Design a protein around this ligand. Sequence first.
Ligand code: CU1
Length: 105
Amino acid sequence: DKATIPSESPFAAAEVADGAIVVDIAKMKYETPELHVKVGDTVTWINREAAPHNVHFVAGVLGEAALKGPMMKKEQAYSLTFTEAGTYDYHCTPHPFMRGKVVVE
Ligand SMILES: [Cu+]
């Protein structure tokens, strides 16, 4: 695999780690839709909206299986720690017009 999951389920926005890089989910978009990070960085998405949102990487992107992130309620967060260089596309399962990518250098 190319990422580890610190918390399998969402956690409170106010619990976000120091050093995490944050991507806000607001205005029905990933507000940083192309994020560039380094190997070993933790990316945290935060849902600012009432509707649930997640991040979803299809099979073969972060590893063999799809990574279907948990549904984040309003003011919840979810993190992934990227361990290998690559370009990792994702989308929102309930709202698949929402697209993003993490580029790990
Ligand atoms: Cu979404």
